[PDB]
Write a protein that binds this ligand. Structure first.
Ligand code: CDL
Ligand code: CDL
Ligand code: CDL
Ligand code: PC1
Ligand code: PC1
Ligand code: PC1
Ligand code: 3PE
Ligand code: 3PE
Ligand code: 3PE
Lengths: 63, 171, 120, 50, 65, 459, 31, 100, 331
């Protein structure tokens, strides 16, 4: 049981700590977008309607 | 922040501290301790993060749906028109849901803010809430889980027949 | 049903008006599925005689695949021909009989009264 | 390849993604024709979605 | 234990005889409560629908359903 | 949807060309990759459903059932690889092929744009399930259980075929997207009464309805563990999915055709929970618990309010995860004591403490502990049935009391008390077993954080 | 476990009653 | 007598020949690599990256859009004295009633 | 504003930190019960500051910090009501729980699962402060069912004992019978007032509140051991002594009383509900104190004592004196 709990915590943290650190790096350096009105004649991209950078990456790459 | 018109707040009136006793209150010392130990480092880290945001600015936009023809000027069983009308109706339904949510937020915020005299001091928010719930209930209640623009139009036609009959029989 | 159509010219697998129709591509998913059936017939043929299933008789597996694709190509040509015949006869019968197919006066939902049944 | 069996399911997903994106081209009869999303084309652009 | 569980589940129906006692207990305990709750909920919903279509049931703030 | 159908078919050469010691690991790995890929279906919109092709689409109802289905395959491979360890290699590959093929049928069952394609896939899901039960089931009763499982479903579904072909001849189409706009009201007549029965009784058997549930505590018990997992987690929810599609067409006749079936399910959730209070078979206790939980989903579909559909799809996903974990816990004790009798192995918390923690959490999700999505679905169904009639709160509350009673009775009976003395082959919990329990429970708990992706098309 | 150690139908003859009482491991007079 | 049948084989213990058994296989290297495949590709990939992926869904079913749009519409029709919602979903001018 | 809300949430997050500590462990701890006792002492210290600056002004706020879900008109948020009731019950419960845990480090010392016991006791405290600080009925239901499940886990602590398992299943039975009325109240408020938030309940202020108050009286009968649903509390003495002392004297069993005090703007306008609460509380405080006169087990006498005092609390709710009832809880 202790070996299972050690392996469970290890394989969660193995990618959880890079995901948490990467999200912190994104939210500090890259960071959240700003709500602006659409400029005249400009048609935005479909992924440019979203606020957080990871949401923009998901809507651009996959969706 | 947010727009103060859609989420209204009456202006704050805090009283000046007028202490009668001589013993120093712990709250001012804990407030200065909070300001020195907590609020200034939080403000410094937030200013650092806001500088990093200001290094690379970019924008997201509010998606503007232009108004398409609604269900009444769509032909019967014309899926290309009534699909657009149905999508328009569903977006309007979800927006009206969020309008009722905004007015509930105003009402509950008023009740907490006014405190003990909330029954007198929140009559306008209660009136706005009763009006918007009356409109929402006449518009979308009893449609069912398979709701559509056809169901809502049939409910509106039944209500308008009832209102026309009641106005006709009153004369 | 359509047995009087192909009675003036009997036992023609593909008539001369079938050539006015575009043939199935050789990358048709139907024809590729028939080729998969040929590969499955090759695998069952290696299995029932206790040969090694994937390895033995690659000439035989390939003749299974080839023969099913070869038959199924002409089967798909006849399929597309008979459905084209069905649509052609449908449209010519609608054209010859306008009194039996009136163009429907379509009303919009502002005039259409549907009874509302509440879910409560 | 020594590990050639570990590219059956991923290449299957790449092939299914390719066939979905190919079928989206055959379903393009209302591209830039819907009453909700029709618009004038931007320069250096011939289709609004692929 | 195996004998007990096989008596409790697997041997019940081969030792069943449809007779007076079992049929009256199967009708009373099987369709009795169904008929009972049917007329209860039908009476309650006919009453609620009659009050709703007369505007008598107070339904002011009811918009979640 | 072809980007999920093609890798599921590529799992067949992946399981037949694998090395003889690698056929579990490769299928587990690549089915986990397919389950990772399943999350692209969360591209949902508030107005439009994610409409792929003429054949496939996915709204917010089919999407959680798809992600649960593609997640269930690696867990079935983990659960079923220990008791099929001494199996022939060819029969082991046939078992894995039946699991992969059942997933292949299900993922294009839920995405069927047209209803007769839904019917073909829906009744195609019988055949791998029947082969799994009647071939890799353990006791003698698997053949009779396969008979009941086959011949309740086909007896219910062959009128459904005539009903769907009738709608095809009348409306001109069985496309669900077209029938969202060409739906006509179904008035009161005897013809439309039997139309309603033909459209609904197949799914009433598959849920199962009370009184027609007699295929279930033999098919779910006499199956192996992968069969029990798929039957409890997906194959009961095919019925609720078909109901939520097909009740588009059955208005307003459902508003009085629903009353006998609402009575059957509101009384069946009391009676099957009472049956769970007196079960000696642990696996049959979980089977009748599944009947008791699906009775609420039947009531929620038949009252057809938005809160009821939201609670019904949340309760379907929650019950899939919870019942699959309860069957896996039952298997984890059956692989040690070789008996499904619940009173035999007692006091197991003294021997297996972390496995008893998994028993505790699955019994808490079974009794709908907030804020689990079990309680979310349970609670929304109770809200909507209260708005339906105010007297249904008596039956819902009495069901919740009996549900807590049999859940914690199961926990106390298997885990608490003095341990059984004459049983000495209680091994420690393997890493496979605890990993199976955690891969059930941890998504079920993480879905409490962001529960909006399991609340259906009308969240 | 086998067939003649499983429960059966209702005993009618006294030798069937004695065989069942032997089966359930108890006295014939107490069965 | 009764027919020719093998006796019931004893249930094997994975911990007798392998005290480090993860319970996947009796071959220890296959067992450890099945453990790593299960743990990595379930927890380290699907659970972690899917919790991140669901956590950052791009406005799932446009609820945030609908709140922002409703704020815009309420901010409009408060300034113009319009009621916040009509009891008629559709304009009564574009509806023909059945006469009586 | 900034000090009040911050120390409010720091109290609850500080109480959740040893749960992360006991879950993220590899070693045998350097005295984890001392760690949880020190944590609850410091949480008492942290909770004293918003209490003092409530005693100064009367400062109240709602912290609706996390939007959780929106069911078409029901925006469910993680919402914390920092009112008179939270400000006077959180430091009392933390001070009592701090003394109960320093008692537990001595009483439960020879127990080899002492870390699990302190984990379970802190989980009870977390669920109880979820209950008493909640602003909507869903989060209050989370704390409600949470203290019910931790009641199960702490009554059946010695799980080899048959009577402990039996009394724990008994307590779950009576509390789910009370939960019938709790979910009746939630269903009524959702259908007739479109809310689970206390604010919209108090501002809409329904007049035909007979049935939801009957549901709330049933919930308090299940939770606070009133007559008809009382016998789980004397059976609940089967657990360890600090379980009894914390949960089944002072902290858990006042939750139905706290539920009926929490709805005081609705019970003040319903004389029928006040009469029901008055008769039920007087029945309970008669019957259980009458049972206590000839008992021989000391923990049964004190359990009938606390159920008699719960009957007295239900009496003083019934006489339209809810703040005296809450004062009697904290006393
Ligand atoms: C932490 C590591 C933990 C272990 C690692 C492994 C974890 C497990 C594996 C996880 C794998 C991934 C899982 C999926 C989730 C992914 C993340 C996600 O979706 O996050 C969602 C959500 C949104 O993230 P986002 O969308 O990226 O941000 C949007 C913003 O626009 C963006 O906001 P922003 O840009 O404005 O902010 C940027 C932010 C970066 O963003 C983040 O950090 C957020 C992302 C991290 C998420 C991590 C989640 C892990 C799980 C957390 C919970 C369990 C933890 C363990 C137990 C803890 C105790 C309980 O920057 C900072 O954090 C820096 C500021 C730090 C302030 C504190 C220090 C100030 C003073 C310093 C003084 C010294 C210097 C002074 C002088 C300096 C001079 C230069 O993030 C969070 O929820 C973050 C967690 C904290 C939330 C608040 C915590 C307190 C709440 C209390 C009240 C509510 C609860 C009450 C309960 C009480 C009891 C009943
Ligand atoms: C493919 C499907 C059909 C394969 C038939 C042959 C299968 C076989 O022999 O497998 C053995 C063979 C390996 O065996 P081996 O080592 O050579 O020796 C055999 C042993 O002696 C075997 O040991 P044994 O015979 O001594 O004793 C064990 C015993 C074990 O058997 C038993 O114990 C008795 C049965 C146990 C219970 C029943 C389990 C289920 C089995 C039947 C399946 C029913 C459900 C099917 C679907 C539902 C509807 C009914 O029997 C077997 O295992 C006999 C071998 C057959 C096993 C597989 C059966 C496949 C036929 C049935 C499914 C397909 C047809 C129906 C489809 C319906 C619609 C979907 O398997 C394979 O090689 C599998 C194929 C892997 C490569 C696939 C490559 C695909 C490439 C596609 C692209 C290229 C073509 C492009 C064409 C297009 C161009 C345009
Ligand atoms: C997206 C980022 C998310 C980050 C945050 C994650 C949020 C929670 C996720 C799930 C947490 C539970 C899983 C662990 C427990 C199960 C295994 C176990 O027994 O471990 C014991 C073991 C320590 O015990 P041990 O002594 O060594 O051995 C066990 C003993 O032999 C015997 O064991 P025992 O009986 O002594 O101890 C078992 C004990 C027994 O205690 C109980 O069973 C009492 C619990 C029920 C009553 C109290 C809670 C009531 C509800 C209130 C809380 C929720 C709402 C709070 C918000 C405010 C109100 C609205 O249970 C616990 O201690 C569980 C603590 C957490 C309780 C959560 C609720 C579970 C109750 C059932 C469902 C309730 C509704 C759903 C709630 C979902 C909330 C997210 O724990 C570990 O070693 C931890 C392993 C790693 C756990 C990772 C969990 C998250 C994994 C997610 C991966 C992907 C996302 C990345 C984030 C990763 C963050 C780390
Ligand atoms: C799980 C086991 C039991 C399953 C039960 C399944 C449902 C029970 C009822 C099924 C009725 C048969 C299918 C009806 C399909 C309706 C299609 C349609 O157009 O209907 C309108 C049509 C109307 O005729 P029409 O369509 O030609 O005319 C046009 C419509 N009007 C009349 C308005 C002009 O109905 C029928 O023609 C007859 C419908 C009833 C048929 C009764 C025969 C079957 C009796 C019940 C058998 C149940 C299973 C028994 C065996 C169980 C196993 C041993
Ligand atoms: C999905 C349908 C099929 C079902 C089965 C699926 C199986 C396959 C699994 C695939 C991967 C998993 C998919 C679902 C993932 C769900 C999780 C998820 O994404 O969450 C996102 C949620 C989304 O929340 P959110 O919506 O507020 O996110 C904000 C949105 N953004 C980030 C864009 C700004 O993430 C969080 O909530 C993160 C919060 C921080 C971490 C958790 C902190 C709280 C922990 C407890 C604190 C203490 C409380 C007191 C109690 C103490 C203990 C008792
Ligand atoms: C030790 C780890 C802690 C973090 C350390 C590292 C960070 C250092 C300090 C900085 C803090 C992090 C940055 C700021 C935090 C994020 C701010 C933000 O906007 O986040 C987005 C949001 C804030 O809410 P929101 O309203 O912006 O978004 C909600 C998302 N939508 C709108 C799509 C629904 O999410 C969070 O902050 C997530 C944290 C949640 C905390 C509570 C968890 C509850 C767990 C139980 C769940 C079940 C409850 C059910 C009942 C509820 C009541 C009905
Ligand atoms: C494999 C089949 C290959 C067939 C080769 C051609 C044979 C031929 O000449 O068939 C003629 C026949 C069409 O003749 P037709 O006049 O339409 O038939 C009237 C029947 N009532 O054509 C056919 O019937 C073609 C279809 C035959 C399919 C047989 C297997 C199914
Ligand atoms: C009525 C009645 O007494 O039926 C008894 C009859 C057998 O008669 P017997 O006693 O053998 O002479 O038994 C019969 O005639 C057979 C059964 C009669 C009908 C039983 C009705 C209830 C069945 C259970 C419904 C569950 C739902
Ligand atoms: C126990 C096994 C497990 C459970 C299996 C499923 C059980 C329930 C299945 C059938 C449900 C009951 C039948 C439908 C009830 C809904 C309303 C209805 O039709 O009531 C029967 C009818 C009432 O009269 P009314 O509806 O006014 O008649 C006009 C109809 N156009 O009554 C009458 O007109 C008189 C009786 C007519 C014939 C009834 C029997 C045949 C129809 C059902 C099959």
């Amino acid at each position: 049981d202790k070996r299972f709990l050690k392996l469970l915590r290890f394989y969660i943290l193995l990618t959880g700590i890079p995901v948490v650190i990467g999200i912190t790096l994104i939210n500090v350096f890259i960071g959240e977008a700003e709500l602006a009105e659409i400029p005249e004649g400009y048609v935005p991209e479909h992924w440019e309607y979203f606020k957080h950078p990871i949401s923009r990456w998901i809507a651009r790459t996959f969706f | 922040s947010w727009d103060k018109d859609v989420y209204p707040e009456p202006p704050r009136r805090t009283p000046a501290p007028s202490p009668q006793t001589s013993l120093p209150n712990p709250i001012t010392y804990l407030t200065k301790a909070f300001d020195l130990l907590v609020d200034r480092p939080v403000t410094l880290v937030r200013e650092f993060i806001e500088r990093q945001h200001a290094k690379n600015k970019y924008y997201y936009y509010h998606r503007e749906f232009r108004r398409v023809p609604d269900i009444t000027e769509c032909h019967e069983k014309d899926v290309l028109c009534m699909f657009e009308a149905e999508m328009q109706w569903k977006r309007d339904y979800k927006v009206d849901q969020e309008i009722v949510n905004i007015i509930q937020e105003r009402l509950k915020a008023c009740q907490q803010r006014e405190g003990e005299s909330h029954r007198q001091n929140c009559a306008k928010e209660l009136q706005q809430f009763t009006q918007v719930v009356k409109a929402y209930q006449d518009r979308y209640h009893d449609l069912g889980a398979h709701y559509s623009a056809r169901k809502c139009l049939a409910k509106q036609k039944q209500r308008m027949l009832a209102e026309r009959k009641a106005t006709k029989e009153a004369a | 049903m359509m047995t009087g159509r192909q009675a003036r010219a009997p036992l023609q697998f593909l008539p001369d008006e079938a050539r006015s129709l575009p043939p199935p591509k050789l990358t048709d998913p139907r024809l590729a599925y028939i080729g998969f059936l040929g590969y499955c017939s090759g695998l069952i043929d290696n299995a029932i005689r206790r040969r090694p299933v994937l390895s033995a008789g690659l000439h035989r597996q390939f003749l299974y695949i080839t023969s099913f694709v070869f038959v199924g190509y002409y089967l798909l040509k006849r399929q597309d021909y008979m459905y084209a015949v069905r649509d052609h006869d449908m449209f010519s019968y609608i054209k010859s009989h306008p009194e039996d197919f009136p163009e429907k006066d379509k009303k919009t939902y502002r005039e259409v009264f549907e009874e509302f049944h509440p879910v409560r | 390849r020594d590990h050639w069996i570990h590219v059956l399911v991923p290449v299957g997903f790449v092939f299914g993604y390719y066939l979905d994106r190919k079928n989206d081209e055959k379903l393009a009869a209302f591209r830039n024709k819907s009453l909700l999303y029709k618009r004038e084309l931007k320069p250096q652009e011939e289709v609004t979605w692929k | 234990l195996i004998r007990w569980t096989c008596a409790r589940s697997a041997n019940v129906y081969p030792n069943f005889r449809p007779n007076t006692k079992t049929s009256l207990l199967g009708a009373l305990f099987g369709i009795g409560p169904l008929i009972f709750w049917y007329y209860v909920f039908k009476t309650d919903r006919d009453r609620k629908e009659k009050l709703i279509q007369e505007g008598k049931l107070d339904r002011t703030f009811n918009i979640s359903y | 949807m072809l980007k999920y159908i093609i890798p599921t078919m590529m799992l067949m050469p992946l399981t037949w060309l694998s090395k003889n010691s690698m056929i579990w690991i490769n299928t587990t790995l690549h089915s986990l990759l397919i389950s990772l890929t399943s999350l692209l279906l969360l591209n949902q919109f508030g107005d439009n459903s994610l409409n792929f092709s003429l054949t496939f689409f996915s709204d917010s109802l089919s999407t959680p059932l798809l992600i649960l289905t593609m997640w269930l395959l690696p867990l079935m491979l983990m659960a079923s690889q220990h008791h099929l360890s001494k199996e022939n290699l060819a029969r082991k590959k046939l078992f894995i092929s039946m699991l992969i093929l059942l997933q292949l049928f299900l993922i294009m069952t839920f995405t069927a744009t047209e209803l007769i394609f839904f019917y073909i896939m829906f009744e195609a899901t019988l055949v791998p399930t029947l082969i799994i039960i009647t071939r890799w089931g353990n006791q003698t009763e698997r053949l009779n259980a396969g008979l009941y499982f086959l011949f309740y479903t086909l007896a219910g579904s062959l009128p459904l075929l005539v009903a769907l072909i009738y709608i095809q001849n009348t409306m001109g189409s069985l496309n669900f997207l077209i029938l969202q706009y060409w739906v006509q009201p179904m008035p009161n007549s005897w013809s439309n009464t039997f139309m309603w029965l033909a459209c609904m009784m197949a799914f009433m058997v598959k849920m199962p309805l009370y009184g027609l549930h007699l295929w279930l505590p033999k098919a779910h018990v006499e199956a192996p563990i992968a069969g029990s997992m798929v039957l409890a987690a997906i194959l009961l929810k095919l019925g609720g999915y078909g109901m939520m599609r097909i009740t588009l067409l059955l208005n307003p006749i459902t508003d009085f055709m629903a009353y006998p079936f609402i009575m059957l399910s509101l009384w069946g959730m009391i009676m099957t929970s009472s049956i769970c209070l007196r079960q000696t078979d642990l696996k049959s206790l979980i089977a009748y618990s599944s009947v008791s939980h699906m009775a609420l989903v039947i009531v929620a579909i038949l009252i057809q309010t938005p809160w009821s559909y939201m609670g019904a799809t949340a309760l379907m996903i929650a019950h899939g995860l919870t019942s699959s974990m309860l069957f896996c816990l039952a298997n984890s004790n059956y692989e040690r004591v070789h008996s499904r009798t619940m009173i035999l192995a007692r006091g197991l918390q003294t021997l297996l403490p972390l496995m008893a923690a998994w028993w505790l959490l699955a019994s808490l999700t079974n009794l709908a502990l907030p804020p689990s999505i079990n309680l979310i679905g349970e609670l929304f169904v109770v809200m909507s049935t209260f708005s339906w009639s105010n007297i249904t709160i008596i039956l819902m509350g009495l069901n919740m009391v009996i549900t807590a009673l049999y859940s914690l009775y199961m926990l106390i009976t298997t885990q608490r008390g003095k341990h059984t003395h004459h049983i000495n082959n209680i091994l420690p919990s393997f890493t496979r077993e605890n990993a199976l329990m955690s891969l059930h429970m941890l998504p079920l708990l993480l879905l409490s954080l962001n529960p909006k992706i399991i609340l259906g098309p009308l969240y | 476990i086998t067939k003649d150690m499983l429960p059966g139908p209702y005993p009618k003859t006294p030798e069937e009653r004695a065989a069942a009482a032997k089966k359930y491991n108890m006295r014939v007079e107490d069965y | 007598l009764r027919w020719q049948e093998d006796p019931e084989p004893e249930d094997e213990n994975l911990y007798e020949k392998n005290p480090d058994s993860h319970g996947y296989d009796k071959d220890p290297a296959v067992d450890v690599w099945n453990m790593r495949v299960v743990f990595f590709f379930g927890f380290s990939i699907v659970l972690v990256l899917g919790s991140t992926f669901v956590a950052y869904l791009p406005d799932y079913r446009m609820q945030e859009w609908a709140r922002r749009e409703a704020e815009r519409l309420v901010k409009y029709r408060e300034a113009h004295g319009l009621p916040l919602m009509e009891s008629n979903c559709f304009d009564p001018s574009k509806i023909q009633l059945p006469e009586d | 504003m900034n000090l009040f809300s911050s120390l409010t949430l720091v109290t609850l997050i500080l109480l959740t930190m040893p749960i992360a500590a006991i879950n993220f462990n590899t070693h045998k701890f350097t005295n984890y019960p001392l760690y949880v006792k020190t944590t609850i002492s410091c949480a008492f210290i942290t909770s004293m500051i918003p209490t003092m600056m409530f005693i100064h002004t009367g400062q109240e706020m709602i912290i609706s910090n996390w939007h959780w879900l929106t069911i078409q008109t029901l925006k469910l948020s993680l919402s914390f009501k920092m009112d008179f009731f939270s400000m006077m019950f959180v430091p009392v419960a933390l001070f009592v729980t701090w003394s109960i845990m320093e008692f537990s480090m001595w009483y439960m010392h020879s127990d080899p699962n002492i870390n699990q016991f302190f984990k379970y006791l802190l989980l009870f405290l977390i669920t109880m402060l979820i209950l008493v600080t909640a602003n909507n009925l869903f989060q209050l239901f989370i704390g409600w069912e949470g203290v019910g499940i931790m009641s199960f886990l702490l009554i059946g602590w010695w799980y080899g004992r048959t009577d402990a398992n039996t009394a724990a299943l008994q307590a779950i039975l009576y509390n789910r019978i009370g939960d019938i009325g709790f979910i009746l109240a939630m269903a009524w408020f959702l259908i007739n007032l479109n809310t689970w938030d206390l604010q919209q309940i108090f501002m809409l202020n329904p007049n035909d509140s007979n049935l939801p108050l009957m549901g709330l009286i049933l919930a308090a009968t299940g939770k606070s051991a009133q007559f008809g649903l009382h016998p789980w509390l004397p059976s609940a003495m089967e657990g360890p002594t600090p379980v009894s002392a914390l949960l089944h004297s002072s902290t858990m069993v006042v939750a139905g009383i706290f539920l009926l005090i929490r709805f005081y703007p609705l019970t003040e306008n319903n004389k029928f509900g006040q009469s029901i609460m008055l008769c039920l509380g007087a029945m309970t405080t008669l019957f259980t104190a009458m049972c206590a006169l000839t008992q021989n087990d000391i923990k049964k006498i004190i359990a009938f004592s606390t159920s008699s005092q719960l009957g007295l609390m239900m009496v003083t709710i019934g006489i339209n004196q809810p703040h005296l009832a809450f004062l009697h809880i904290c006393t």
